[PDB]
Amino acid sequence: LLTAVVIILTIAGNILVIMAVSLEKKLQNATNYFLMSLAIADMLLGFLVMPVSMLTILYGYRWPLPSKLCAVWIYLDVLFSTASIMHLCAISLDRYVAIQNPIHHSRFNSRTKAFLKIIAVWTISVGISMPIPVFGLDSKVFKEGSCLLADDNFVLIGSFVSFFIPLTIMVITYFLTIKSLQKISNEQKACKVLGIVFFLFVVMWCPFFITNIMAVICNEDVIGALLNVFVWIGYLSSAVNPLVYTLFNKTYRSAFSRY
Numbered sequence: 001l002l003t004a005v006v007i008i009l010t011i012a013g014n015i016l017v018i019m020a021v022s023l024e025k026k027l028q029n030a031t032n033y034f035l036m037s038l039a040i041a042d043m044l045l046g047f048l049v050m051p052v053s054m055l056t057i058l059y060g061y062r063w064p065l066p067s068k069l070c071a072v073w074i075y076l077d078v079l080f081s082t083a084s085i086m087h088l089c090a091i092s093l094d095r096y097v098a099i100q101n102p103i104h105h106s107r108f109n110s111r112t113k114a115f116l117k118i119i120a121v122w123t124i125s126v127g128i129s130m131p132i133p134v135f136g137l138d139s140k141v142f143k144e145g146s147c148l149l150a151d152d153n154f155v156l157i158g159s160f161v162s163f164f165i166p167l168t169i170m171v172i173t174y175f176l177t178i179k180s181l182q183k184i185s186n187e188q189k190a191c192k193v194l195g196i197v198f199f200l201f202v203v204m205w206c207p208f209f210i211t212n213i214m215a216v217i218c219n220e221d222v223i224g225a226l227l228n229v230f231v232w233i234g235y236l237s238s239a240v241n242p243l244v245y246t247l248f249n250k251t252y253r254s255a256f257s258r259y
């Protein structure tokens with residue numbers, strides 16, 4: 001159905017971002033290397049998890065794949081989602097320390113900061129998702145002919161650290177960054193871009209996490225039919241992070257117009 005366009009555009013945008021990074025020497029700084037790591041974490045979403053959800057949807061929520069890949073597929077989904085969330089959380093914090101005091105950010109501006117930041121966010125993304133192979137693996141991962149999470153203590157308590165803390169950091173960091181920038185037109189264009197990025201992240205991922213948190217804290221068919229669309233809306237963020245984090249730059253616009 002409409003998810004095929006999501007898969008195709010998720011492939012196309014991330015591939016074009018990777019191709020524009022690879023054969024351009026003007027975009028080789030550390031800030032853009034973190035975005036290359038984001039496109040690495042985002043290419044693998046649309047080819048390893050979303051076709052699996054595709055033929056899960058086309059089979060009427062009865063999974064034709066074998067039962068041995070349920071915990072692995074759930075672990076891949078949680079790993080790529082927490083990676084593509086933590087990437088934006090570290091991007092916002094780096095953007096804050098590069099907006100507040102540019103001198104002390106440019107003092108330590110190197111590839112060492114990018115290596116440490118990528119290592120930290122990937123350690124967080126693996127360490128959040130690592131209990132799913134070792135505690136969920138079939139009652140914690142399989143239910144009624146579909147591969148869905150059912151260990152409610154992990155679904156609630158994992159969503160606290162994997163989303164409601166990095167969302168609290170985006171809230172406090174967007175407040176301080178827009179207060180510092182509000183304290184001229186270049187600055188206001190960055191204010192509009194920051195507002196679009198923040199008000200799209202809290203719109204595209206948040207409904208799934210308040211839906212699953214409310215379903216754990218509490219109408220089962222209504223919550224299931226909401227989850228079956230809000231996961232795909234969560235997948236639509238992977239159709240956007242290649243686009244809206246590069247297309248406001250002139251070099252990336254020229255590179256995309258070249259292809």
Ligand SMILES: CN(C)CCc1c[nH]c2ccccc12
Pocket residue numbers: 077078081082149154155158159162208231234235
């Ligand atoms: C379905 N996908 C978007 C879930 C991503 C996710 C990140 N953290 C989680 C914690 C529990 C369940 C799912 C997730």
